[PDB]
Amino acid sequence: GMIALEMRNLGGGEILHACPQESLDKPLPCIVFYHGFTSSKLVYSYFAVALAEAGFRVIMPDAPEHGARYQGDEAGRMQRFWPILQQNFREFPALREAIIAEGWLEGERLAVAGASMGGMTALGIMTHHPELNSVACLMGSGYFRSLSQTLFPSPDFDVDSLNEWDVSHQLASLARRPLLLWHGDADDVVPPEETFRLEQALRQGDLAARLTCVWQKGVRHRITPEALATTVAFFQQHLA
Amino acid sequence: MIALEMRNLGGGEILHACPQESLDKPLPCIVFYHGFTSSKLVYSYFAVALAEAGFRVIMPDAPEHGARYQGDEAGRMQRFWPILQQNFREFPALREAIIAEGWLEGERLAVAGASMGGMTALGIMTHHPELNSVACLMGSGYFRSLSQTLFPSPDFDVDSLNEWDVSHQLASLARRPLLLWHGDADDVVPPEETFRLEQALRQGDLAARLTCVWQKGVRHRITPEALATTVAFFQQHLA
Structure with missing residues (x-):
């Protein structure tokens, strides 16, 4: 069926919202989807298209220093991957409350998903919110302390700031609800071992x-039609 | 606010996006072609971005992709070049279907694509000087030579690409505005493809x-900057 998409201000910033046209004035099961690093909610909006076509409401925010929050400091942003990720984790409760205040959420049927930096965001959120319906992480990692030593290392950032979010001492929370981990086995950006280590x-x-x-x-480090179909089918088995 | 739907035109599924207030009106239209082993759904962010700018966007399936993919993953990898050639050939029928829906305002029609889809857009250009403008992102126009290194297709007659290869008809690429975009670290379609066409x-x-x-x-990736460049280009030439 037909879907509606709009840019709207929610919680003090700009989000992308997609849902079935026939349900604009109704609460729905909701998915918050987090985009990748140096990308944007608009570049990842195909997830909103695919999930809204399956009947879900999708909310896509801007990561710190991304989208409408970006002011053109490209070199500085390159040095702030890890503080950006940390702020992404911390912003989730306020975003959830703003979604609820809109009348958009049916019951407790809220899921969180993301790709790359956004999949890292989803896993960190899950450690603090095992009441979520379900979670998806595509070509991401939960091993922030380890991975921050080599992938976009951030100068003048204390790795101990990642302690509360790293999944190493939080595996039972990741086990509490349905979790999708997807990864290409030839990824040359986020090593596939990040996901293999967690699965094992x-x-x-x-x-x-x-x-x-x-x-x-x-x-490699790219979302395929098969990954997108896997994500939709996963949410159809837990959130719907 | 934009509207997006799947529509079946003559046995082919298309993705259609446009401003909600304009669903019943003709508009300037952009046909956007997706990349190899991808789909119109994975590339649908182009339809979102361009519809937010006021355009109608039509996205078809390439042969053996999307709703036309019915298996044979391994075979599809051996048929890149026949798939591309058939993508060129389908444009006139697709345009006729768009017009028959009442979707197109006058002759205000542009084509664009990424990767294999940008190749498709360039090949279409060579045969369609009546188009408004064309965009090729991380692609190439040098089909005959590129077919020997990028996903070569066994038992495919390369000479059938000569009528489409841009290097056999450079003046046809000069007839209308053309955007070439490329990341300079692309390890799938070499950036030299775009540098050599520009030169x-x-x-x-x-x-x-x-x-x-x-x-x-x-690398071989569409960035927010590439997407913004594409929107700005079509605003410049369809205004």
Whole structure:
């Protein structure tokens, strides 16, 4: 069916909202989707299209220093990946409250998803919010302390700031609700081992009963039609 | 606020996006072609961005992609070049279908695409000087030579690409505004493809309508800057 999409201000910033046309004036199951680093909610808006076509409401915010928040300091942003990620985690409760205040959320049917930096965001949120319906992380990681040593390392940022969010001491929270981990097995940006290590830790700990882990052979750091279909099908089995 | 729908035209599924207030009105239209092994849904952010700018956007499936993909992953990898050639050939019928829907205002029609889709847009250009403007993002016009290195297709007659290859008809690329965008670290479609076309047009005195945009350090990926450049280009030429 037909979907509606709009840019709207919510919680003090700009979001992208998509939903079925026939449900603009109704609460719905909602997915917050977080975009990747140096990308934007508009570049990742195909997730909103695909999920709204499946009947969901999708809310896409701007990460710090991205989208309408970006002021052109490209070199500085390159040095602030990890503080940007940390602020992304911290902004989730206020965003949830703003969604609820709009009348957009049906009950407790709220999920969180993202790709790359956005998938890292989703996993960190999950450690603090296992009441969520379900979570998806595509070509991401939960091992922030480790990965911040090599991937876009941030000068003058204390790695201890990531302690509360890193998934190493939070695996039972990741096991509490349905979790999708997707990764291309040839990723040359976020190593596939980030996701393999998490899958193996959950399985070895008897914490994998709610885990869906999908690998795509030969795929690098890019979302494919198969990854998108996997994401939609996952939410159709838990959030719908 | 924009509206987006899937529509079935003559047995082919298309993605259509436009401003909600204009659903029942003709508009300037952009046909956007997706990349190889991708789909119109994965590239639908172009439809979102351009509809937010006031355009109607029509996105079809390439042969063996989207709703036309019915299996044979391995076979599809061997058929890049016949898929591209058939993508060129389908444009007139697609335009006729768009017009039959009442979607197109006059002759205000442009084509664009990324990767294989940008190749498609350039090939269409060579045969359609009546178009308003054309955009090719991280693509190439040098089909005959590129077919020997990028996803080569066995048992495909390369000579059938000669009628489409831009290097056999440089003046046709100069007839209308043309955007070439490329990331200079692209490891899938080499940036040299775009550099060589820009230089060929400049050396032929055929670059007066050419806009060439590079992004330093960017690989085979559409960035927010590339997307903004595409929107700004069509605003310049469809206004």
